[PDB]
């Protein structure tokens, strides 16, 4: 399966090893092993670095665990002063929910985009429920949001499942717009503001008017959503077939999705979308067959890597290292390309 088992922190590459239940660290600018004190009881599919850079979420279809990143000290700024093996505190999130419900799957996890606040983790599950967790209280979600029409979720019982979600930039209602994609291609919007102790969550409002209206429902194959941090917001909707819809979010008052372009990836297949931190007009698509780069100029699609599924993908943007993509295949082939 396609996975994302790597991240980069301060110019160290962290690679998750599922057998050892540990991260291997390599200082790109020096090998240390960050061992989980409590190993994950589930297969890790994704590794998410927190915005605060102090935590790493280990994400699997049956559970989530947060690793506390050890403190750096000494002459080289190494973890715990340069020990070869560092024992990292690990904390399971929502463990009771996944252990009690054999049919419940995690669809996606995302960090709340605030750097100044305690890192909040949002879990999207196959029952169409968004659960917001604070790292202080990991047993009880701070907020539970059901994605049913306000008139298991009734929609999840009809087979309509929410598949992906992503945050747009801070907008004046100031709150973060959260876009939520269903398997049907239906996109919803919700505003989330986190003020220190009170979580103000807006009503779910996803009546985006497709421009142009679909002749045949955007297939029951919608698999990923990416918000590009621009004004107006540009949403990229990806399908398992390889179609990418570039939607401009305009005011209708429920906002409307205007499809500016539709781009087919010549894949010969669930897609993961990755923002480019340097080029806001560019993003990357990782899938079982390779990496595509998509540039919004028709859009420029470059097949960068044709594979052996991608096991990890990251874009390094460092002053000293330059801009480079790192790709790891399932056979542990590390492919580095300057961007």
């Amino acid at each position: 399966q396609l996975r994302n088992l790597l991240c980069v922190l301060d110019g160290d590459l962290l690679v998750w090893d599922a057998e050892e239940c540990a991260f291997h660290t390599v200082t790109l600018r020096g090998e240390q092993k960050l061992l989980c004190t409590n190993p994950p009881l589930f297969d890790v599919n994704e590794v998410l670095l927190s915005p605060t850079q102090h935590h790493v979420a280990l994400v699997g279809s049956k559970g989530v665990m947060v690793l506390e990143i050890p403190k750096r000290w000494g002459k080289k700024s190494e973890f715990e002063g340069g020990e070869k093996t560092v024992n990292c505190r690990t904390i399971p999130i929502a463990e009771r929910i996944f252990t009690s419900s054999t049919s419940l799957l995690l669809k996606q996890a995302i960090w709340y985009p605030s750097e100044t606040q305690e890192p909040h983790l949002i879990l999207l599950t196959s029952d169409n429920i968004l659960r917001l967790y604070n790292l202080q209280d990991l047993f009880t979600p701070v907020k539970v949001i059901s994605l049913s029409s306000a008139e298991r979720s009734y929609k999840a019982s009809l087979g309509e499942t929410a598949v992906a979600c992503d945050f747009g930039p801070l907008a004046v209602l100031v709150a973060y717009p959260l876009y939520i994609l269903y398997e049907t291609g239906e996109t919803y919007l919700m505003y989330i503001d986190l003020q220190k102790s009170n979580i103000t969550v807006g009503k779910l409002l996803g009546p985006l008017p497709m421009y142009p209206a679909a002749e045949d429902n955007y297939g029951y194959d919608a698999c990923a959503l990416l918000c590009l941090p621009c004004v107006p917001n540009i949403i990229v909707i990806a399908t398992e077939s390889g179609l990418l819809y570039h939607c401009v979010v305009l005011e209708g008052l429920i906002p409307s999705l205007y499809v500016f372009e539709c781009v087919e990836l010549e894949l010969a297949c669930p897609i993961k979308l990755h923002r480019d931190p340097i080029c806001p007009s560019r993003y990357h698509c990782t899938h079982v067959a390779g990496v595509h780069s998509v540039g919004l100029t028709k859009c420029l699609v470059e097949h960068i890597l044709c594979t052996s599924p991608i096991q990890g993908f990251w874009i390094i943007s460092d002053l000293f290292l330059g801009t480079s993509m790192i790709c790891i295949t399932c056979d542990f082939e590390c492919i580095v390309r300057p961007l």
Binding site: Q1, D43, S61, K62, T102, S103, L105
Partner: protein
């Protein structure tokens, strides 16, 4: 818990298929079965119609959908 089982099952079926290929009559037929081959599940249907149904499902469709069970049975 479900998807994990599924991938392990897929891997095991791949392994069985590879073994069959390398070998290429009784264990032949047994591993014919361990994959869910429709013919060999038919040539020894000798118990009942529902027994046939169950065997077929177990091998061909390990994950079963209650709604389409009627079609499968027909």
């Amino acid at each position: 818990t479900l998807t994990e089982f599924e991938l392990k099952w897929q891997h095991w079926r791949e392994e069985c298929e590879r073994h069959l290929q390398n070998g290429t009559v009784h264990m032949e037929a047994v591993c014919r079965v361990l994959l869910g081959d429709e013919e060999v599940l038919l040539e020894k249907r000798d118990t009942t119609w529902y027994h046939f149904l169950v065997s077929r499902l177990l091998f061909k469709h390990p994950t079963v959908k209650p709604t389409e069970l009627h079609f499968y049975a027909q």
